[PDB]
Amino acid sequence: VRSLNSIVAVCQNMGIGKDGNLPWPPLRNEYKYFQRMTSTSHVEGKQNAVIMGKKTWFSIPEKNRPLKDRINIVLSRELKEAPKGAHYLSKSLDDALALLDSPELKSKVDMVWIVGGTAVYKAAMEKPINHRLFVTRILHEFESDTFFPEIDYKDFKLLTEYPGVPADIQEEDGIQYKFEVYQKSV
Ligand SMILES: NC(=O)c1ccc[n+]([C@@H]2O[C@H](COP(=O)([O-])OP(=O)(O)OC[C@H]3O[C@@H](n4cnc5c(N)ncnc54)[C@H](OP(=O)(O)O)[C@@H]3O)[C@@H](O)[C@H]2O)c1
Ligand SMILES: [Ca+2]
Numbered sequence: 001v002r003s004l005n006s007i008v009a010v011c012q013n014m015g016i017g018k019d020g021n022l023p024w025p026p027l028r029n030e031y032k033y034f035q036r037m038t039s040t041s042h043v044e045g046k047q048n049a050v051i052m053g054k055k056t057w058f059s060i061p062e063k064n065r066p067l068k069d070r071i072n073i074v075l076s077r078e079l080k081e082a083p084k085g086a087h088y089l090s091k092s093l094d095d096a097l098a099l100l101d102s103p104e105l106k107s108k109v110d111m112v113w114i115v116g117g118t119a120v121y122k123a124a125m126e127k128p129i130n131h132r133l134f135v136t137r138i139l140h141e142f143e144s145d146t147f148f149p150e151i152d153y154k155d156f157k158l159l160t161e162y163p164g165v166p167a168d169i170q171e172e173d174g175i176q177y178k179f180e181v182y183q184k185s186v
Contacts, residue, residue: 001097001100001101001112001129002129002130003112003129003130003131003132004112004113004114004124004127004129004130004131004132005111005112005113005114005131005132005133005134006113006114006115006121006124006125006131006132006133006134007034007037007038007113007114007115007133007134007135008116008121008133008134008135008136008148009022009030009034009135009136009138009177010135010136010137010138010148011023011024011138011140011141011142011144012138012139012140012141013141013144013147014147014148015142015143015144015145015146015147015148016116016117016118016144016146016147016148017059017117017144017145017146018142018143018144018145018146019145020055020058020059021059023142023143023144024138024140024142024175025173027138027172027173027175027177028172029170029172030136030138030172030177033136033179035067037113037134038050038067038070038113038115039067039068039069039070041110041111042110042111043110046108046109046110047069047070047071047108047109047110048069048070048071048109048110048111048112048113049070049071049073049100049105049109049111049112049113050067050070050071050072050073050113050114050115051073051075051090051093051096051112051113051114051115051120051124052072052073052074052075052114052115052116052117052120053074053075053076053116053117053118053119053120054074054075054076054078054079054083055117056115056116056117056120057072057074057083057086058083062085065084065085065086066085066086066087070113071087071088071105071108071109072085072086072087072088073086073087073088073089073090073096073099074086074088074089074090075090075091075092075093075096075120076089076090076091077091077092092123093120093123093124093127097127100112117146118146118147118148118149121148121149122149125149125151125152128186129186130184130185130186131156131183131184132181132182132183132184133151133156133181133182133183133184134165134179134180134181135179135180135181135182136177136178136179136180137177137178137179137180138175138177139169139175139176139177139178140175140176151182155184156182156183156184157182157183157184157185158180158181158182159181159182159183162181165179165181166179167179
């Protein structure tokens with residue numbers, strides 16, 4: 001494909017989860033940011049595709065699957081068939097990428113978003129393709145048992161500005177956070 005997009009929220013230690021869920025209680029504004037960023041396509045009659053690992057898919061409340069208005073792709077070396085609600089099942093990132101390039105998908109899909117977990121992010125990170133990483137840095141220490149892979153500061157350059165991403169420190173429910181965008185160019 002042309003380029004990937006990755007979106008994650010991280011607390012101070014780069015933690016992204018705890019016990020199968022997020023490390024922090026719900027932040028409204030963070031949420032809407034995710035829905036908005038992942039769902040919004042810049043082309044009529046096109047839909048965005050989201051890619052995620054098995055543990056992440058299941059983390060989503062059942063009645064809430066699949067993420068409305070996007071093509072849900074789950075990665076798993078173990079599942080035989082796509083979990084109930086997913087659109088496609090794939091064995092590796094590569095398979096996922098290939099599926100996307102296929103005739104039927106080729107045309108129905110706008111942007112591709114990697115929504116985790118660790119291994120998905122990592123895999124996407126290493127592909128020598130154009131890639132933009134949308135990070136929400138939550139300026140607090142919540143205990144996490146899952147972490148964001150290490151990012152290559154030589155490859156991913158932090159943008160100083162980007163359209164429609166507030167640049168100031170935000171706050172909600174007594175917690176502050178900041179939005180950051182890194183860009184990898186091949
Ligand atoms: N903060 C955030 O932005 C954010 C975003 C997502 C998730 N989360 C949290 O992270 C946790 C889930 O993440 P996780 O890292 O533990 O799990 P995960 O990546 O969601 O699930 C991992 C599984 O998915 C399959 N998989 C993963 N990478 C794959 C690859 N490259 N090729 C094929 N299959 C692959 C494998 O399943 P098989 O064993 O079946 O092969 C692997 O066991 C939860 O706590 C969730 O709340 C946070
Ligand atoms: Ca397994």
